[PDB]
Design a protein around this ligand. Structure first.
Ligand SMILES: [Zn+2]
Lengths: 34, 97, 539, 36, 42, 112
């Protein structure tokens, strides 16, 4: 979540999204194995 | 790492997973790099090696089996060979990997 | 900075020239935060207020990607396209196409041209004409509604393999439960490795359904800023139309958009209000139009372009609610609250551009009106109550409606059909607690439509006949149309035959029900025992 | 249905239609409860 | 009259909560099952 | 309801003699000995049934034409298609590797 402010006092919020949840699941499995 | 670059290519670039798609892209000359797992059969691996030699396409030997390569791609099914048509937002081609 | 010159990727000279000729004097925050990323290997999910440069925000990256991927060259193949754009309504897609054409006006010559094609359901062009001129003209941009673009892509003459850019405008509406069936197929046909741009003013509502589109590398974007007034009136339903009249001939406006629930209601009330204006019930320089989505496409386009072009009132369904922008619209009336509340903000959102003085009004049924206002309040919408006197209803309004219905049986049929359609529309209502079928004023609504008999419905029988105390027989009711008058008289002369056909159908349905022989046996036993007790108790 | 959830065709049809209604309604359920 | 609204609101909220818990459990189970199937053929 | 038995010398329930019951034009139920069914020819590399080749007894092949027991491709009637394709690819790749090894050897003793 990154907020950017312009000259009109209007802010834009930009957040990256993760469509493939498998990356997190494999990462958590590897972390618990570690 | 090397898996991060592959994941970046999957998310942003252009790619083909599987032997048939990789061979088709090599025939069309649309491939920039081919990643080959260590689990691939010797005949198909040798045919891919000969095809890459014919088409002058870079070859990288993945350090793992087909399911490790699939997980690196982010898929829950085994993939034996991957072809990178366009790196996109990643830098796998620049780093010679 | 909001300056075109200091953007990341140095927009093409002809796109810059088109922007300068069109103007905008700068780039909006939406166009500042979306164009750099939608052309930079990132999918885009954009939520922004109406009329904030969103259309150009997804049109400029489309042209940039088309030029970048060498789509405008002789190397590009035939029967292939590059970019697709989808919108839920035909007018919105045509407006997007007009914007793209305006941008391509300044496209330089001496190079392979870039063209667009609009694929909407029309009665002036079959899908095969679309395929023919797609093959002949070879465009790289397709813009259209889900149905006709699905039909177009399903034709074997069109190849989708070279597509690399999909844009969905009003993406919350296209991922709705109704549209998801078509959009799933449309995205199924197209290649998965692509760049997707979803743009909608209520993109947050389609929460987890955005991943159904197939986003790869997405970045959600939220843009936020009394422009307009939001009022409501709580009145008896039978007076509602009269109140509408009392607004049309008294309030000050240049354009008033009046929303109706159904299309048949639009036509029926348009005809009745025209009849009232014939008798000079309302005296003003008002021109009244009707525009619902079941018309032929050419008629819809002609009506919309006549209304857009002096004080005008529009009777429209939810087709015009979302997306399209008619300038100089002052008043918006929602004769009923919408079936879904998410569209409410769109229906009253046609006004307030650049903080213009515009008013929105809504009508309530007096029964469960205590639940709609807090429901909007929880959703951060404040509705200030407005008190409007019901002028001119001293006598004969429902009587006038009734005696106008008695002139032509077609008017009776249209009225009853509209009432039944509204009842079905109310049946499919979200927020069930707020809008209850039991608490619905069936008699009030029937009085609103000028009917004199409640149609046979399960709702009428259960939750609740002749509104006019001296009943009128249908036998002496004349259809007033010569071709159908003889058909009605023939059917009347065949009353017993059709009745017996239905009787035989009913008996055959009885014999085909679950274990019908056993049911007849049980009825025999019950009838024997009951008819025995009916005399044994008395004796 | 492989797990003995439905005992006959009527149960399957009723489950289908009830699932359709509940899918129609959950989206407004939250604000519907918050308002009260 | 209002008892029906309260009753079906509470019932369907309870149904949604149970559905959320059940869907989380089912997703975890199916994910583990397909991972085990992938790693089982060797 | 009429009972039938073997029509030959063997009285035992052996795989050699098996009985079916048929109604003759005389209106009676009678036994009939059934021969052993034929077996589909199998590929000599993978053991799968060969496609396009008739299934007959060993001695019934001598009385049919060659097109009923062969396939027009090389090794047709002996090996299936995928095995032949694998043989071709493997032979070509082996020859190419032999060429490469010979070139490398010619280079490596070219030093002295
Ligand atoms: Zn074989």
């Amino acid at each position: 979540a990154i907020t950017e402010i312009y000259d009109d006092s209007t802010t834009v919020e930009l957040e990256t999204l993760e469509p493939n949840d498998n990356f997190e699941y494999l990462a958590q499995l590897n972390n618990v194995k570690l | 790492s090397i898996n991060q670059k592959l994941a970046l290519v999957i998310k942003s670039g252009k790619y083909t997973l599987g032997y048939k798609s990789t061979v088709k892209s090599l025939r069309q000359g649309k491939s920039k790099l081919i990643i080959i797992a260590a689990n691939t059969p010797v005949l198909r691996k040798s045919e891919l090696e000969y095809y890459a030699m014919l088409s002058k396409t870079k070859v990288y030997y993945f350090q793992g089996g087909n399911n490790e390569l699939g997980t690196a791609v982010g898929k829950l099914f085994r993939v034996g060979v991957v072809s990178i048509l366009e790196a996109g937002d990643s830098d796998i081609l620049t780093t010679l990997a | 900075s909001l300056e075109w010159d200091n953007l990341g990727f140095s927009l093409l000279p002809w796109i810059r020239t088109g922007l300068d000729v069109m103007g905008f004097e700068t780039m909006t925050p939406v166009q500042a935060s979306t164009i750099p990323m939608l052309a930079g290997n990132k999918d885009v999910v954009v939520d922004s207020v109406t009329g904030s440069g969103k259309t150009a925000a997804f049109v400029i990256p489309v042209l940039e990607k088309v030029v970048k991927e060498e789509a405008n060259t002789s190397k590009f193949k035939k029967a292939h396209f590059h970019s697709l754009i989808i919108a839920p309504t035909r007018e919105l897609s045509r407006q997007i196409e007009s914007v793209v054409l305006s941008f391509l006006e300044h496209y330089p010559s001496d190079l392979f041209p870039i063209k667009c094609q609009l694929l909407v359901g029309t009665n002036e062009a079959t899908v095969r004409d679309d395929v023919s001129n797609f093959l002949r003209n070879r465009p790289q941009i397709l813009i259209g509604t889900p149905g006709r673009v699905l039909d177009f892509l399903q034709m074997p003459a069109v190849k989708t393999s070279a597509c690399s850019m999909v844009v969905m405008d009003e993406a919350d509406r296209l991922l709705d439960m109704s549209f998801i069936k078509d959009t799933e197929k449309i995205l199924r046909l197209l290649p998965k490795q692509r760049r997707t741009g979803l743009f909608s003013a209520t993109m947050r509502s389609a929460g987890s359904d955005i991943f159904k589109t197939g986003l790869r590398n997405p970045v959600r974007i939220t843009v936020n800023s009394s422009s307009l007034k939001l009022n409501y009136c709580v009145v008896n339903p039978a007076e509602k139309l009269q109140l509408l009249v009392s607004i049309l001939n008294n309030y000050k406006f240049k354009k008033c958009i009046v929303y109706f629930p159904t299309c048949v209601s639009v036509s029926y009330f348009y005809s009745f209000i025209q009849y009232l204006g014939k008798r000079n019930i309302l005296v003003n320089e008002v021109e009244i139009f009707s525009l619902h989505g079941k018309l032929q496409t050419s008629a819809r386009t002609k009506t919309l372009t006549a209304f857009t072009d002096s004080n005008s009132v529009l009777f429209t369904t939810d087709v015009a609610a979302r997306g399209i922008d008619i300038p100089d619209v002052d008043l918006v009336i929602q004769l009923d609250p919408p079936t879904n509340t998410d569209m409410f903000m769109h229906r009253c959102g046609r006004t307030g551009r650049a903080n213009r003085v515009g008013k929105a009004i809504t009508f309530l049924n007096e029964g469960r009106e205590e639940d709609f206002i807090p429901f909007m309040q929880v959703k951060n919408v404040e509705l200030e109550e407005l008190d409007l006197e019901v002028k001119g209803i001293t006598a004969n309004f429902y009587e006038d409606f009734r005696n106008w219905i008695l002139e032509d049986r077609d008017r009776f049929d249209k009225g009853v059909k509209a009432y039944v359609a509204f009842i079905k529309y109310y049946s499919n209502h979200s927020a069930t607690s707020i809008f209850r079928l039991q608490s619905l004023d069936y008699v009030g609504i029937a009085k609103l439509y000028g009917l004199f008999r409640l149609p046979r419905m399960p709702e009428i029988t259960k939750y609740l006949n002749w509104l006019v105390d001296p009943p009128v027989n249908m036998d002496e009711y004349k259809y007033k149309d010569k071709k159908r008058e003889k058909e009605r008289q023939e059917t009347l002369k065949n009353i017993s035959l059709i009745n017996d056909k239905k009787k035989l159908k009913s008996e055959l349905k009885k014999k085909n029900l679950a274990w019908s022989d056993k049911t007849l046996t049980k009825e025999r036993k019950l009838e024997r025992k009951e008819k025995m007790s009916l005399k044994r108790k008395a004796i | 249905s492989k797990g003995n959830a439905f005992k006959h065709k009527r149960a399957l049809v009723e489950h289908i239609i009830q699932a359709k209604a509940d899918a129609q309604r959950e989206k407004a359920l939250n604000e519907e409860a918050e308002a009260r | 009259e209002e008892e029906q609204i309260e009753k079906d609101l509470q019932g369907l909220q309870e149904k949604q909560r149970l559905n959320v818990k059940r869907e989380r459990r089912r997703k975890n189970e199916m994910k583990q099952k397909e991972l085990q199937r992938m790693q089982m053929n060797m | 309801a009429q009972r039938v038995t073997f029509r030959r010398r063997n009285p035992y329930n052996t795989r050699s003699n098996k009985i079916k019951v048929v109604k003759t034009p005389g209106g009676i139920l009678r036994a009939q000995h059934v021969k052993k069914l034929a077996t589909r020819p199998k590929c000599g590399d993978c053991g799968s049934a060969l496609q396009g080749i008739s299934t007959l007894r060993p001695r019934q092949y001598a009385t049919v034409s060659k097109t009923h027991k062969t396939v027009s491709r090389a090794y047709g009637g002996s090996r299936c298609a995928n095995c032949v394709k694998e043989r071709i690819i493997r032979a070509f790749l082996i020859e190419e590797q032999k060429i490469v090894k010979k070139v490398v050897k010619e280079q490596t003793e070219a030093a002295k």
